[PDB]
């Protein structure tokens, strides 16, 4: 059977000093004892009768997508394309799914990386593995959401019971955003917020849907007057922005609205 001579693996049969060489199957897993290298089990990508095969660190022939000197090769199961043998690198092109993992094989019969447009959809294949990205992912300075199928998403997406927004380019949109004439506010992680936040224009109110008014969830509402929200007090002027410092209203009331947060810290009732 299979014996280890000096960190390298070999195969011998009953006669004595009968080194075997060539393809052998030791149970489930198949090996190749290189007749060039004294019958030593081949590790990594190796050429046998002009065909390419891949063996793990233990010398057993493997199937699937693997990094090569050429790029990502597909060492296909038997009869996958033009009656190929088990683990033979095939001249494959197109989409390829192997147990959830999705790959796209470019015209050179090798796995593609980064942005690839497939049909009318955008996909992002890992530069590390060649596998399509799924879910929320940072790609460069921006964040994108991809399907369970690796299709890049545009519009509002519910991720972990929070709303995110991906523009016409799939980018995640953070801060005070204009979405087709309506304004919304996203946290720096992308999560759409309700409350008053610091916008380029100043402090603005992004309100919950009200049955009257007819505002969308988290849509900027052109508020004016005092706002009592989340145990906080704000006053908005005709700018539909919250005021800071001292403010006295004809109703008697004298307020001090925190310079940093625009929230009421002091309220003296007068006449």
């Amino acid at each position, epitope marked *: 059977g299979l014996i280890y001579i000096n960190d390298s693996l070999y195969y011998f049969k009953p006669p004595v000093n009968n080194l075997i060489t060539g393809f052998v199957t030791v149970g489930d897993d198949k090996y190749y004892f290189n007749p060039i290298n004294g019958g030593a089990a081949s590790i*990594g990508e190796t050429i046998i009768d002009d065909k390419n095969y891949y063996f793990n660190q233990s010398g057993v022939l493997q199937t699937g997508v693997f990094s090569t*000197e*050429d*790029g990502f090769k597909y060492f296909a199961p038997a009869n996958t394309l033009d009656e190929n043998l088990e683990g033979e690198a095939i001249d494959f092109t197109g989409k390829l799914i192997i147990d959830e993992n999705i790959y796209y094989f470019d015209d050179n019969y090798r796995g*593609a990386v980064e942005w690839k447009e497939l049909d009318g959809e955008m996909h992002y294949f890992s530069p590390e*593995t*060649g596998k399509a990205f799924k879910g929320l992912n940072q790609i460069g300075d921006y964040k994108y959401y991809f399907n369970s199928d690796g299709v890049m998403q545009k519009g509002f997406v519910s991720i972990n019971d929070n709303k995110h927004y991906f523009d016409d380019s799939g980018v995640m949109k953070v801060g005070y955003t204009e979405i087709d004439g309506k304004h919304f506010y996203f946290a720096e992680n992308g999560e759409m917020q309700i409350g008053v936040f610091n916008t380029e224009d100043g402090f603005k109110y992004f309100a919950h849907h009200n049955e009257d008014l007819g505002n969308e969830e988290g849509e900027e509402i052109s508020y004016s007057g005092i706002l009592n929200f989340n145990n906080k007090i704000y006053y908005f002027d005709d700018s539909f922005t919250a005021v800071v410092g001292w403010k006295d209203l004809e109703d008697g009331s004298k307020y001090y609205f925190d310079e940093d947060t625009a929230e009421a810290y002091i309220l003296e009732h007068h006449h």
Partner: antibody, heavy 119, light 109 residues
């Protein structure tokens, strides 16, 4: 950021032996092949060899086959180029460059290691 | 084997001008394996173009790559001061990587 940082400038006498390093940071070291390019003074670029950290597979230019050996991380997260008996003709700039996983272009380069070899 | 011959060797043009650099291969070659590198003096090479026409990360739009078969071209639509350097074209084939001898882009004055 993705970067390969190389060992300092080397001045060795002829026939001596040298091992030069290239530390990868900002990326998954085991996911990318890493290569060695020689730039003789005032001349262009010559490819020496490539190494795969996560397979340990190596392939050399027939012109560098035997004359040098490529290896990696010895735990974390460095590649190596070494000579057993240097020549004065080995005085050059040595670059290690990370390879893209389509279609073999070297996307990240090291600052370089100047290797000066004279008696 | 595969031999990359670049022309001119020196290209003297003034800032704002269009630069056209050539790379001719000794034999027909895959566009996937064609790359262009820029090397400023006393600095390391940097990737500009991969896969003959694709632009590497953070590479300005003035840099454009084209060609097929044996004739390849790097174009700089408008030369900026930083753009004056050496340009090497590269290819992979038959288990080995090959580089061009370079083209210097000098400032015409």
């Amino acid at each position: 950021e993705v970067q390969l940082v190389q060992s300092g400038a080397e001045v060795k006498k002829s026939g001596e032996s040298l091992k030069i390093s290239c530390k990868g940071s900002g990326y998954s070291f085991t996911s990318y092949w890493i290569g060695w390019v020689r730039q003789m003074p005032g001349k262009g670029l010559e490819w020496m060899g490539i190494f795969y950290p996560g397979d340990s597979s190596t392939r050399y230019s027939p012109s560098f086959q035997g004359q040098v050996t490529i290896s990696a991380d010895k735990s974390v997260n460095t590649a190596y180029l070494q000579w057993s008996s240097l020549k004065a003709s080995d005085t050059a700039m040595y670059y290690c460059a990370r390879r893209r996983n389509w279609g073999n272009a070297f996307d990240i380069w090291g600052q370089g290691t100047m290797v000066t070899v004279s008696s | 084997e595969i031999v990359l011959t670049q022309s001119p060797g020196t290209l003297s043009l003034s800032p704002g001008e269009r630069a056209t650099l050539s790379c001719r291969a000794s034999q027909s070659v895959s566009s996937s394996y064609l790359a262009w590198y820029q090397q400023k003096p006393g600095q390391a090479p940097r990737l500009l173009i991969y896969g003959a026409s694709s632009r590497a990360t953070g590479i300005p739009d003035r840099f454009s790559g084209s060609g097929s078969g044996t004739d390849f071209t790097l174009t700089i639509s408008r030369l900026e001061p930083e753009d004056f350097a050496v340009y090497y074209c590269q290819q992979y084939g038959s288990s080995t990587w090959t580089f061009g001898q370079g083209t210097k882009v000098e400032i015409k004055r």
